[PDB]
Amino acid sequence: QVNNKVLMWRLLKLSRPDLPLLVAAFFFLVLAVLGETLIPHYSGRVIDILGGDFDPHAFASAIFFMCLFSFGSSLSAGCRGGCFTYTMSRINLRIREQLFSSLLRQDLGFFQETKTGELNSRLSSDTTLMSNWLPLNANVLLRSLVKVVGLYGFMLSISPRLTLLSLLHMPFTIAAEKVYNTRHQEVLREIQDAVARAGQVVREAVGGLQTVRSFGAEEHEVCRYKEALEQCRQLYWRRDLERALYLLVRRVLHLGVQMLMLSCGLQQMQDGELTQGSLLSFMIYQESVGSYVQTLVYIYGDMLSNVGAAEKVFSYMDRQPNLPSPGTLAPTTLQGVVKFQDVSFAYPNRPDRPVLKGLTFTLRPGEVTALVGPNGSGKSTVAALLQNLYQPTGGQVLLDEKPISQYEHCYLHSQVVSVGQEPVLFSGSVRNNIAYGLQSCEDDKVMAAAQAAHADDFIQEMEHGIYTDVGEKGSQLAAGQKQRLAIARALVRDPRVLILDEATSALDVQCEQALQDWNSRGDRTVLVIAHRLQTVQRAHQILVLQEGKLQ
Amino acid sequence: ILKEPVHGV
Amino acid sequence: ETRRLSLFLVLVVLSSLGEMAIPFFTGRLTDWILQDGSADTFTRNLTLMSILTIASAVLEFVGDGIYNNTMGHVHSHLQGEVFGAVLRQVTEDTSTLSDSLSENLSLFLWYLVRGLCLLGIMLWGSVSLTMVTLITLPLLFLLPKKVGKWYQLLEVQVRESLAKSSQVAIEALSAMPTVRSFANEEGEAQKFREKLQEIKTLNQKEAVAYAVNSWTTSISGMLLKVGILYIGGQLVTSGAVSSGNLVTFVLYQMQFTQAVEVLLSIYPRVQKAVGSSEKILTPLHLEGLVQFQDVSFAYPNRPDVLVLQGLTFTLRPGEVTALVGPNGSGKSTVAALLQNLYQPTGGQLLLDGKPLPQYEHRYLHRQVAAVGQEPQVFGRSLQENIAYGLTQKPTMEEITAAAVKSGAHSFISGLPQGYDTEVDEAGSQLSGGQRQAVALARALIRKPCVLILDDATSALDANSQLQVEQLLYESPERYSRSVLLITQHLSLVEQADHILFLEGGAIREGGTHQQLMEKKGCYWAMVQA
């Protein structure tokens, strides 16, 4: 297919910045191929001089040359291996960086639709397989092709009537190798499917351990697992038998070709057309070719899978996001007035199934606006679309008589901030998490945010102060500290619009009395989302909405 | 059996 | 089996002995053409070499087949026993360990016997060259073992650094709404770039180590070959060794090199696989008479975490009973003791005049049935997932009658393909009321003498609760069975013959529903709330 050729062209364009390393590696490869081609000729000339009369000059010259060629081949092979390994690693690192940069620009709907494990497989092992195409597979393929051509040239130089027999014999070996490779691949993927089916049983058993323990059906589960194990064992036995039969066939064919070469070589020897060293070098050349052909077939088979993995990674990368045009606006001063004009929103995950319909209200800088009602957790949609996370299908949300799509990303998300019911924490320091997303923030701002959100209680004890190391995803803190750090993180930016989710239902009462009654709520629009009427004890403008419609 | 050839980088 | 392994050992010894005839006979044939022999001898060696090598290949095939057929059985039995042991208290590890150990042991034994036989024939051919090879073996092949440790250290540093970078990227991607809300995509890109920049230097070290390792591992063998060829040439000049013997040694040295290389490349993997492996009376009939006397139990974590104490609940046969109270009542321990899922740790208990563990396991599990607090359905059909654990397959009419009694007939009929409807794993796609009805049907299909159905109203609806109340309270003479319903539906607790409340692991109240609601117990406090 031309698609595979396009993929190879894209891979070459990716590997383009590593030109000098690849040139040096190819030159080292050529030197190694020449050295290992020329070694057995002198290895046979040593036997040639040893068999007949003794001449010290020829023996010394032959052993010196052979040692020199062996040393040169070893040195160049080591250099080629090092250069190719470095090139492969550089390619892997570059494509990992490019893939992460491309992935970070996609819309949230793609991340909701696509599971995390697929992205991890793309970024962990699938990106590694494409880095073995040029520095590994093309390397061994080219070296095997050139080695085979040179070896057959030398065998034709030695004796054509002995080379023609190998030429006739090789297609049988090629066909047998291809058939065995196809059968092995088929059996291997069947074995993988069977072992996945076997692991499904133990996953089901460990998932529902309480049920089976209550009903005492342990023997039934172990019988199902025994049946799955027998099904896998039959496939394993078939694979082993096929591999053993292939090895037996290969050994018999090697016997036949060796006997034919020996018989014809001795028949030509009796006419004086060959020497013992010539025959020995011919045996070494035949033994090398018989392995290099199979190496070539295996390497092509692996190159196909490498190209497939590269196709998967490139398909994952080349997705075009559905975000609107980037916004160039960013005023020095923002009033904070927000208007929704019949915004109507439907989730892109389930299109034509609207969640919001004809919503319309206005927000004031000095008036506190609260939202009430269960809504089936549908109140988070207006909070998400208020930060330009999801573009509205109908209507329009606007700030200061300007639509939200025309504002600069950093400026808009620095002027309008929000906290959810569940805070999300990273693996950095407390200072890192407080100043998250900030280009430069002094420790004084962190102190102000911590004392304004009443975090300094827990933070003061914290070893190494604020420079402590939080656990992964906040594993070293409880829910109260998570909420305190989240509200301090929101407060540290001095936002013109502040949105809170569950300010009293989930968040502490002290934080609700602090953030909603300080200077950050004196001249800034605050949108608090609560499922109860307790927020009515301080709210000014209360809005209730159910099933996508406002009362 | 036999050790399949590794033919590394 | 030891006998089959011994037979495989005999077969592999014979095959390794017979394989080596090719270089010996080609060297003898070159010597034969050197000294003007006869054609009868020539065809004799040709036929003998062909027969020996063919027999070696055939015996290799037979021995392999026997070894693989036995090791498959061994691995399957080990996996089954591991699963059976872990269920009455990893499997993928065990399977990978089993198959890797199998192939490693096969390669190790094959190449060890081949190397031993090769050493034997080479020593028979000429003492001097074999002694030289033996004395240059370890002093020249210890260096790959020295370099491989440094290489493995650098390579494992590479993989752990890559894994850490991948974990950082995955953590950044999993929290994408927060990153988009704080506009910190460039920060995550910068962190990823810093991780790769930290990787790069060590990676260069790894490349240099690869170059040095390849240099050493080729130069050692090449120098060994050069030295043995020079010594053989000097000896054949001296005349103590024939030239054909030199050809045989030239052909044998390569095979010995491959054998020792395979052994040294195999042994550490075998060692680490071994290190990974080192870590591993039936009752006739009953009326449902269940009685307790000061019964106590403890949590499985530690005996200090007491579950309950002083339990004397008398499950009246042919009547219902409701257990209420706060979380300190320990009704879960009472349910576990009724289902005999946990051993008692104090007091006395009896089921139909006999202790519950004293009876047969299958009979006790089939008689004293229970419904789980969280309903779950296994990944099977509704004719199986609603009859799991049954000794005999129920009839379709019987299963339909059970579903009708449990109210699951409509759910089964609405599903496609009738009773053979596909169900998701662990009841993921099933509704809460449907799952509760399926659990009730699974409990009622065994015709229990006592029902411990509780906590099913958390996911059930009001209609399901009304159906459960109609099945329980309005049962004909309770179907000659008892009940221990401890569900959260307080409406059905009023219809119970004798409700009770407990606190702190001990009973706190009891009596009739009106008496309990008029007393000072926890049930009255909940009613007055």
Numbering used by the authors:
A (entry chain B): 131 to 681
B (entry chain C): 1 to 9
C (entry chain A): 183 to 271, 288 to 478, 494 to 742
Publication excerpt:
Peptides destined for display are first delivered into the endoplasmic reticulum (ER) by the transporter associated with antigen processing (TAP). Each subunit has an N-terminal transmembrane domain (TMD0) that interacts with other components of the larger peptide-loading complex, a six-transmembrane helical domain (TMD) that forms the translocation pathway, and a nucleotide-binding domain (NBD) that hydrolyzes ATP. In this study, we analyzed the structure of TAP in the presence and absence of peptides. These structures show that TAP suspends peptides across its transmembrane cavity, anchoring their termini in two distal binding pockets primarily through their backbone atoms.
These three peptides, b27, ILKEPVHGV (a2), and QYDDAVYKL (c4), are natural products of the antigen processing pathway and are presented by HLA-B27, HLA-A2, and HLA-C4, respectively. Nevertheless, the peptides are suspended in a central cavity surrounded by TMs 2-6 from both TAP1 and TAP2 in all three structures. These interactions, including eight hydrogen bonds, a cation-π, and two van der Waals interactions, enable sequence-independent binding to TAP. At the N-terminal region, the free amino group of each peptide forms a cation-π interaction with TAP1 W308 and two hydrogen bonds with TAP1 E242 and D246. The terminal carboxyl group of all three peptides forms hydrogen bonds with TAP2 N269 and R273, as well as longer-range electrostatic interactions with TAP2 R210.
